[PDB]
Design a protein around this motif. Sequence first.
Motif, PDB file in Angstrom:
ATOM      1  N   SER A 251       0.844  -1.187   0.000  1.00  0.00           N
ATOM      2  CA  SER A 251       0.000   0.000   0.000  1.00  0.00           C
ATOM      3  C   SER A 251       0.884   1.243   0.000  1.00  0.00           C
ATOM      4  O   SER A 251       1.882   1.299   0.716  1.00  0.00           O
ATOM      5  N   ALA A 252       0.524   2.229  -0.816  1.00  0.00           N
ATOM      6  CA  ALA A 252       1.230   3.508  -0.846  1.00  0.00           C
ATOM      7  C   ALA A 252       0.283   4.644  -0.465  1.00  0.00           C
ATOM      8  O   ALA A 252      -0.829   4.731  -0.975  1.00  0.00           O
ATOM      9  N   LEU A 253       0.722   5.499   0.452  1.00  0.00           N
ATOM     10  CA  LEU A 253      -0.073   6.649   0.864  1.00  0.00           C
ATOM     11  C   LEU A 253       0.496   7.945   0.291  1.00  0.00           C
ATOM     12  O   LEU A 253       0.967   8.808   1.035  1.00  0.00           O
ATOM     13  N   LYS A 254       0.443   8.071  -1.032  1.00  0.00           N
ATOM     14  CA  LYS A 254       0.960   9.246  -1.729  1.00  0.00           C
ATOM     15  C   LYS A 254      -0.179  10.017  -2.407  1.00  0.00           C
ATOM     16  O   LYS A 254      -1.285   9.494  -2.561  1.00  0.00           O
ATOM     17  N   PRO A 255       0.086  11.273  -2.804  1.00  0.00           N
ATOM     18  CA  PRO A 255      -0.841  12.037  -3.646  1.00  0.00           C
ATOM     19  C   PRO A 255      -0.782  11.556  -5.090  1.00  0.00           C
ATOM     20  O   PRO A 255       0.106  10.778  -5.439  1.00  0.00           O
ATOM     21  N   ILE A 256      -1.712  12.018  -5.919  1.00  0.00           N
ATOM     22  CA  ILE A 256      -1.776  11.569  -7.304  1.00  0.00           C
ATOM     23  C   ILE A 256      -1.495  12.679  -8.318  1.00  0.00           C
ATOM     24  O   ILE A 256      -2.040  13.784  -8.227  1.00  0.00           O
ATOM     25  N   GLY A 257      -0.630  12.370  -9.279  1.00  0.00           N
ATOM     26  CA  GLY A 257      -0.316  13.285 -10.361  1.00  0.00           C
ATOM     27  C   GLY A 257       0.745  14.306  -9.997  1.00  0.00           C
ATOM     28  O   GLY A 257       1.813  14.357 -10.610  1.00  0.00           O
ATOM     29  N   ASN A 258       0.447  15.122  -8.990  1.00  0.00           N
ATOM     30  CA  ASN A 258       1.330  16.215  -8.607  1.00  0.00           C
ATOM     31  C   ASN A 258       1.827  16.100  -7.177  1.00  0.00           C
ATOM     32  O   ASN A 258       1.127  15.578  -6.314  1.00  0.00           O
TER      33      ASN A 258
ATOM     34  N   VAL B 295       7.471  17.435   1.609  1.00  0.00           N
ATOM     35  CA  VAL B 295       7.035  17.469   0.221  1.00  0.00           C
ATOM     36  C   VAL B 295       6.849  16.040  -0.252  1.00  0.00           C
ATOM     37  O   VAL B 295       7.813  15.293  -0.394  1.00  0.00           O
ATOM     38  N   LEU B 296       5.599  15.667  -0.491  1.00  0.00           N
ATOM     39  CA  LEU B 296       5.263  14.296  -0.847  1.00  0.00           C
ATOM     40  C   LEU B 296       5.155  14.129  -2.357  1.00  0.00           C
ATOM     41  O   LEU B 296       4.276  14.707  -2.992  1.00  0.00           O
ATOM     42  N   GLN B 297       6.054  13.343  -2.932  1.00  0.00           N
ATOM     43  CA  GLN B 297       5.996  13.049  -4.356  1.00  0.00           C
ATOM     44  C   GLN B 297       4.797  12.159  -4.655  1.00  0.00           C
ATOM     45  O   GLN B 297       4.469  11.271  -3.863  1.00  0.00           O
ATOM     46  N   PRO B 298       4.142  12.384  -5.803  1.00  0.00           N
ATOM     47  CA  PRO B 298       2.986  11.565  -6.186  1.00  0.00           C
ATOM     48  C   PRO B 298       3.411  10.134  -6.492  1.00  0.00           C
ATOM     49  O   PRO B 298       4.589   9.875  -6.733  1.00  0.00           O
ATOM     50  N   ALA B 299       2.456   9.215  -6.479  1.00  0.00           N
ATOM     51  CA  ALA B 299       2.759   7.798  -6.643  1.00  0.00           C
ATOM     52  C   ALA B 299       2.909   7.386  -8.106  1.00  0.00           C
ATOM     53  O   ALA B 299       2.270   7.964  -8.990  1.00  0.00           O
ATOM     54  N   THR B 300       3.752   6.385  -8.354  1.00  0.00           N
ATOM     55  CA  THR B 300       3.809   5.737  -9.659  1.00  0.00           C
ATOM     56  C   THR B 300       2.476   5.071  -9.912  1.00  0.00           C
ATOM     57  O   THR B 300       1.755   4.736  -8.971  1.00  0.00           O
TER      58      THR B 300
END
Lengths: 415, 415
Positions: free
Chosen positions: B171-178, B196-201
Amino acid sequence: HHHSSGLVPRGSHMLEMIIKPRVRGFICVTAHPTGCEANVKKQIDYVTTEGPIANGPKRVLVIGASTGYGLAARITAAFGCGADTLGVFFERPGEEGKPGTSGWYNSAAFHKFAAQKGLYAKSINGDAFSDEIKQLTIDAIKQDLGQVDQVIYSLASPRRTHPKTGEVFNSALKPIGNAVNLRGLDTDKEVIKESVLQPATQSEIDSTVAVMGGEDWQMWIDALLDAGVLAEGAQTTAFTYLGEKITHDIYWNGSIGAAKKDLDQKVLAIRESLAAHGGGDARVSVLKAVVTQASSAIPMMPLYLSLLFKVMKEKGTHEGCIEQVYSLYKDSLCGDSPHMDQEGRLRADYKELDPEVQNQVQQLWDQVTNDNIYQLTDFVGYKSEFLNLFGFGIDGVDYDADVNPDVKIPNLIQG
Amino acid sequence: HHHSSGLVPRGSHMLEMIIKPRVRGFICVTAHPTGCEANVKKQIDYVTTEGPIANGPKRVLVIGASTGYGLAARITAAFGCGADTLGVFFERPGEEGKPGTSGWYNSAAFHKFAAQKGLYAKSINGDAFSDEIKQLTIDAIKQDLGQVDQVIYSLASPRRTHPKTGEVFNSALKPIGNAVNLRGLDTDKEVIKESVLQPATQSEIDSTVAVMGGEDWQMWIDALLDAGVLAEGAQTTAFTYLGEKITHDIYWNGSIGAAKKDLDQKVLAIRESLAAHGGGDARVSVLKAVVTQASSAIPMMPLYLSLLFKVMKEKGTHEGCIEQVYSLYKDSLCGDSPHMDQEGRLRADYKELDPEVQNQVQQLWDQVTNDNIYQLTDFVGYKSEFLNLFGFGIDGVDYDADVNPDVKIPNLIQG
Ligand SMILES: NC(=O)C1=CN([C@@H]2O[C@H](COP(=O)(O)OP(=O)(O)OC[C@H]3O[C@@H](n4cnc5c(N)ncnc54)[C@H](O)[C@@H]3O)[C@@H](O)[C@H]2O)C=CC1
Ligand SMILES: NC(=O)C1=CN([C@@H]2O[C@H](COP(=O)(O)OP(=O)(O)OC[C@H]3O[C@@H](n4cnc5c(N)ncnc54)[C@H](O)[C@@H]3O)[C@@H](O)[C@H]2O)C=CC1
């Protein structure tokens, strides 16, 4: 195995533990490493504060050096006279999940603080009654010090394996001849229990004298002498307690008292040996009743001390181990005019035997009951001092914090 | 080996331990058996107090039944509807020296309190995603209940092993796209960190949907259906969170949100299956943000909840898991007029989405700094609720006392 297993470090909590007082009777099954260290530093600090003692020994062997009066000697010799100390004791090392004994942590802190002031500290852990331990002690003196000029004999044990016979003697804390109606303190329920202590068999008195009498002290001086590791003009003393009539049925005229009397006997032969060796000396030193693991186990003592603390605190003569032993060094072991008594013992216990203290204590004894314990007695002070032995109730110590019980000691010979 | 070794019982302290909060981040590595029990009783008591819920289910399967919302369902079903509950979870048993997980102690206490009120409690410990665990669950239903009439799906996990492929999804808890500039709360130092949270692959989004999406929920209903252990007219719901625009970049429109959207997809096919089976139903239930192990791990949430607690406590709409789930049962799962939304989800989270709460929270968000945390936010309430998860900070619980961590569970199938 759970849902988040392995995605998470266990951390140090796994090897460390929270350590709190666990008391059943006069037994506490835990000891706090940080608090023992702090308790020892308290004692060191007291001696440092009072100031250096002139005319003190410089190379000191303390037999029974890890707790109570023996520790207090070790600290007084070291931090008051600047002496090198070789300590002999018998303690359990700490390991993970399993706190070591008080004495172990006391000694670890001792080596630590000694190194900080450039003092010599080496210790030997094992049965002081055995020949092996005596040899190991001699070798250590040989290699590092050449000779010692003071031997403090401070053992308190419930048993002894005779170094020659196989025999294992067990110490008995009974009265002699006649049974005693004891009015005591139940320390857990905090009420007045009332017992009846049967007197000891001859067989038990002999065992108590074998354990806490002077044979081993004698064996030590002799072993040291003929290895040539005792300096000319050396001084050895062994600690004892006399008390006054209230304690007499149980202590002085009880089975433990029989042993302490064997002490006064053996000290003569030992003094003779040290006299012949460059004008040396051997004395029995009498100290006041304090709270220690040894005294706690003695019937009537918990209540006796509870009372004694109250009266002496009011009078302003209340002291513990470290003050007793400092003043014993200053006034009598190293001082010009020594407090010698009719038997030729040194004395530091006089403030306790003050007839005014003893009478005031005595009239409080028959009159204590389950309702007035916290007003007639200093049971509080007693408890605190008891907990202090094991590193508990110390200020500045965070008892909620994890602590690693595996505390090792540099220059510790293990036998 | 010391001088008093063996003349003294070690006692129970040897098998028991003092257990205190040990927190690193949103992780607490200990759990208190007595406090989990008391925390569970608190929840049970709340439900009992509010009173019985009419028109409730009677034979309930809770998948994810040991902590947080799943536990709250188990307690609501059991103590509010008198239902028999079969709980599925994945928790670590306690053993000597090693406290089990929260969920383990929660469930032990659950079985205990259930037995006291004559309710049925059996639980299965193991991977809910696996076929094996599904089978074991079916057998248990077969043998004891015949059928269940409600299936609560309440899993929160960072990973899943696909029951078919070998594949292990994370499971990944990242933002999407940006990428996102997160202004968060460092819970240990108690300051405002800024990340600063990088968006998920895509690869990660797929993994998050595989873990927290609806495939497994679907697999469960199907497995149950064709074993014939689901009653006609049965009801199944899976929990979700929507939140409002402040949480959207990270949650609803983030990778975890992608998964929760897969939920709305799968619920259609599942509803179809239950409709065909005697007029049954499948809904997604939306709950408010509360403090749990799952939500703690979500970026921004600690501060979000800290704020949310403050505002809602003032407004008087603040609740935790047990109040949420009780009211979800009363108002929407069992009630006459259900809170259905545009998508056909049940809703218990409305008091949180009140535009007045969200605006008040939002204007407090940009304006919180290292000096005003204890005045702008209810960081205190948050911490307390977090500690509560693990059985800490509970009233009536003596955290200085020894406790045996080896707590076993009757009627616990271990897979
Ligand atoms: N506690 C009191 O109120 C008073 C104590 N004393 C005397 O002072 C001496 C010491 O007693 P405390 O300091 O109170 O007891 P304690 O229990 O604090 O210390 C005993 C010491 O001897 C050691 N020990 C015991 N057995 C051993 C063995 N087989 N081998 C090596 N070391 C061993 C211990 O490790 C410890 O260092 C005793 O002679 C005692 O009778 C005399 C006056 C009053
Ligand atoms: N915490 C919140 O603020 C909100 C939570 N939710 C949702 O409610 C559901 C439950 O989340 P929480 O109660 O907060 O989390 P939680 O961490 O308290 O509970 C998770 C439960 O699932 C079990 N579990 C995890 N992996 C498992 C596995 N492989 N096999 C068997 N059991 C497993 C755990 O043992 C535990 O019983 C989730 O869908 C979550 O997204 C939805 C609304 C808001």
